[PDB]
Amino acid sequence: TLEKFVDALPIPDTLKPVQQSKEKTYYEVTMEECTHQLHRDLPPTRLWGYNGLFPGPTIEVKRNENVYVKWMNNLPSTHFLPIDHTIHHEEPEVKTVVHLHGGVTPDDSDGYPEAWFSKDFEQTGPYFKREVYHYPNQQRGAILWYHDHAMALTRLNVYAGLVGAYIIHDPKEKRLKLPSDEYDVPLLITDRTINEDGSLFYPSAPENPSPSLPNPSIVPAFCGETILVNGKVWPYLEVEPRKYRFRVINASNTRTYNLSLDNGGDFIQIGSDGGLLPRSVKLNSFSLAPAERYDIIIDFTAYEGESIILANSAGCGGDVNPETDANIMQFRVTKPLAQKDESRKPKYLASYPSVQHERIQNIRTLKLAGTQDEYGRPVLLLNNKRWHDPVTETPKVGTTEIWSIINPTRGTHPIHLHLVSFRVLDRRPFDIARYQESGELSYTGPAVPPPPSEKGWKDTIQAHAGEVLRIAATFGPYSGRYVWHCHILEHEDYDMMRPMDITDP
Ligand SMILES: [O-][O-]
Ligand SMILES: [Cu+2]
Ligand SMILES: [Cu+2]
Ligand SMILES: [Cu+2]
Ligand SMILES: [Cu+2]
Known part of the structure; x- marks a missing residue:
């Protein structure tokens, strides 16, 4: 290793x-x-x-x-x-x-x-x-x-x-004095499996492939053995003892991360997929599924001299291994200050998305499902339609819909709509066996409103197993042909993706 x-x-x-x-x-x-x-x-x-x-x-x-x-x-x-x-x-x-x-x-x-x-x-x-x-x-x-x-x-x-x-x-955000320039750093996280000769490994089939299977065969999920950030395996970053802004992007195919600092320090979330939250949120950890972004401040001021690991507790096909995928990268608080830290970590960031009061034009209910192909493999489907089926999601330009996404499968799917950002309304548990047997939706508990991290604007949203997720989206300002899909790439390609027409009357 x-x-x-x-x-x-x-x-x-x-x-x-x-x-x-x-x-x-x-x-x-x-x-x-x-x-x-x-x-x-x-x-x-x-x-x-x-x-x-x-x-x-x-x-x-x-x-x-x-x-x-x-x-x-x-x-x-x-x-x-x-x-x-x-x-x-x-x-x-x-x-x-x-x-x-x-x-x-x-x-x-x-x-x-x-x-x-x-x-x-x-x-x-x-x-x-x-x-x-x-x-x-x-x-x-x-x-x-x-x-x-x-x-x-x-x-x-x-x-x-x-x-x-x-x-x-946005130059109007400058007055907030968030850490900027060299103190504003993208972190693109990708998991990979690398052979001894340094070549990329990507599976040519499921392990122990039925002789039925084609070769190569798509796999339903990819979990990499190693974690990279910005193209290096488990790297270190030397930082000054002061406030930094990080733009954290999950650019992995399948893997979800659940991130924390091993010295017990906090992240200050200032932003989601769709931009600044209305208020900063202090967090000890956060989940990040493929395509999700977190805009965060980490304050290294009190940690001069320390090595702090950005750690990961989320398994991918099994529990995290403490020697490998439990690790993302290491911060080393040893760089001398180039200047006084003049950055800020304000509480008040942006208007609330809830100041908006748009009429609900339509309510769609969409199910995450699938079938089995002639080879015995799982085919993942949005509303039991193939990508090539005639378009069914046809919102009108300028209007707001609520989408109710029903997930009766065993896992989370990070659902993404092109063009728009959206608000999260709530999530609610339901009886999966009842839904599967009759198609009837019976709730096993009240709706749960979004945590503060999901009270801004999202474009990729985790839809957990045995829940109905409701989001509200305004479709605009462009009309035309777009897509919506699961952002687990192995699902997306077979066949968890649908066209989306935004229509102009
Ligand atoms: O990825 O859209
Ligand atoms: Cu994407
Ligand atoms: Cu999926
Ligand atoms: Cu997209
Ligand atoms: Cu896409």
């Missing part, structure tokens, strides 16, 4: 524009097969990287900044990870498309799974319109991130290394 905390945390450089003016900012990002050492003791690992980097470069934009990105595929024509040809039915093997997660984006710049392109746009999927994506950024300051979304290949192209951070800065 790799020795923990021997590599310094990489800080991705901030991408420089190819062209910028006051009316427009223009970037170019090229997907490249590259090699990078992931740990002191490993040979360099072959990866797919935005601009040949893992993670990709951090993009930083201002609210309402008029941004264009030309995302280019300059990858090999063959993949290096195991492709299952039975999950989707002449197309190029390597297909890519960039989704800016949390982006308030016109539909043809949103990275629709069927808007894929091969190397140099030589072949393009049926929903492809444009090479240069347009991000108007007319939305709250928040932590976003970008990753590959290509139909039936997401779990592989993301696992290969196609992820990066994207920060929107």
